């Protein structure tokens, strides 16, 4: 992810088949002639898509030009959460399944994994960050406190941002409960709130290298969303 001052990010296409698949996803959803109500509704929860982009001198180097979801914030607090019970897709080899499950064997049970967070603290005027090892260390016993960490500024627990997050996830959950044409693997929710304000949050779906046609509800994604909502709800009782 490369931030541009014009309020966009450039995401470099991952190696094949992942990068081409994510390009195809965005191209399908943002098709100029799309009249599918499911895909039109989905646009509200994605970064705005500005099409494929490559440097003027390097047609080989493929990027997606996407809305920077953090752009409108002064001191954005950012958390990336992978959603689902399986981080591998329906066409993974035995090797690949074992690789993905070993990366976080609690994915089936918890339904989400914190990929990282960047939290602005008022009283130090600085950012703590957690890398992928943080979320991969979280268990059933520590997931609530693990998630809570995102909402701790230098002073209080930002229950305002917690409640707003629930309300926005609920809309995304509503979309998932009203569609049976896409299943999403190893995709994420990007949380942003203002660290410098009240109840102002972004929650956007990102990372679509493993999105596939389906005939069913995305049950794994629904489970992950519902557990995440339940965890956030319990934090409101702190
Ligand atoms: C400052 C900052 C940090 C982070 C972690 C993410 C972002 C970010 O803002 N808008 C985004 C749209 C898409 C993605 C994306 N798609 N696939 N992978 N990342 C990331 C985005 C911005």
Curated annotation (Swiss-Prot):
Protein's name according to its UniProt entry: Inositol polyphosphate multikinase
Obligatory cofactor(s): Mg(2+)
Effect ascribed to mutating residue 100 to R: Decreased activity with inositol 1,4,5-trisphosphate. Increased phosphorylation of inositol 1,3,4,5-tetrakisphosphate
Amino acids binding substrate: 18, 82, 96-103, 132, 210
Enzyme Commission identifier(s): 2.7.1.140, 2.7.1.151, 2.7.1.153
Organism whose genome encodes this protein: Homo sapiens
Substitution effect: residue 18 to A: Strongly decreased enzyme activity
CC annotations in GO: ciliary basal body; cytoplasm; nucleoplasm; nucleus
Summary of the function given for this chain in its UniProt record: Inositol phosphate kinase with a broad substrate specificity. Phosphorylates inositol 1,4,5-trisphosphate (Ins(1,4,5)P3) first to inositol 1,3,4,5-tetrakisphosphate and then to inositol 1,3,4,5,6-pentakisphosphate (Ins(1,3,4,5,6)P5). Phosphorylates inositol 1,3,4,6-tetrakisphosphate (Ins(1,3,4,6)P4). Phosphorylates inositol 1,4,5,6-tetrakisphosphate (Ins(1,4,5,6)P4). Phosphorylates glycero-3-phospho-1D-myo-inositol 4,5-bisphosphate to glycero-3-phospho-1D-myo-inositol 3,4,5-trisphosphate.
């Amino acid at each position: 992810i490369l931030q541009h001052p014009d309020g966009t990010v450039l995401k470099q296409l991952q190696p094949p088949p992942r990068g081409p698949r994510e390009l195809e996803f965005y191209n399908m959803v943002y098709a100029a002639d799309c009249f599918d109500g499911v895909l039109l509704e989905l646009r509200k929860y994605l970064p705005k898509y500005y099409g494929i982009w490559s440097p003027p001198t390097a047609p080989n180097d493929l990027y997606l030009k996407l809305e920077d979801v953090t752009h409108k914030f002064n001191k954005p607090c950012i958390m990336d959460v992978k959603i689902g019970q399986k981080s591998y897709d329906p066409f993974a080899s035995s090797e690949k399944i074992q690789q993905q499950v070993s990366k976080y064997p609690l994915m089936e049970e918890i339904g989400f994994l914190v990929l990282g967070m960047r939290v602005y603290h008022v009283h130090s005027d600085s950012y703590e960050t957690e890398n992928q090892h943080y979320g991969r260390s979280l268990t059933k016993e520590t997931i609530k406190d693990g998630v809570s960490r995102f909402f701790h500024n230098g002073y209080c627990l930002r229950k305002d941002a917690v409640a707003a997050s629930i309300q926005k996830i609920e809309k995304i959950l509503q979309w998932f409960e009203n569609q049976k044409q896409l299943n999403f693997y190893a995709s994420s929710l990007l949380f942003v709130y203002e660290g410098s304000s009240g109840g102002e949050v972004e929650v956007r779906m990102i990372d679509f290298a493993h999105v596939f046609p389906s005939n069913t509800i995305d049950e794994g994604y629904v489970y992950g969303l519902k557990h995440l909502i339940s965890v956030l709800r319990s934090i409101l009782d702190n």
